[PDB]
Amino acid sequence: GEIIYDGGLSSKLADVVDKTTEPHNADGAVKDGRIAPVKLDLEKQKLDKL
């Protein structure tokens, strides 16, 4: 007989990244208007500029 349903494109709820990501704000449907997170080189095992 004629084929009515033979599957199709399947929508996925989630996109799970497999790579470690740097901290970030919202950039999709929600756009964070605040300043992006500040990166600080805080903990140093050896003195650099002191």
Partner 1 sequence: FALAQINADDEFIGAIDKESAEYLDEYATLARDISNSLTLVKAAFGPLER
Residues that bind partner 1 (CB under 8 A): 35, 38, 40-50
For tokens 């500029």, the residue is 49
Contacts of 23 (CB under 8 A, 6+ apart): 37
Of 3 and 47, which has the nearer Cβ to partner 1?
Answer: 47
User: Which CB, 27 or 48, lies closer to partner 1?
Assistant: 48
In the complex with partner 1, the residue whose CB is nearer, 31 or 44, is: 44
Output the CA torsion 38→43→49→50 (10° steps): 130
We find the least distance from the C-beta atom of residue 36 to partner 1, in angstroms, to be: 9
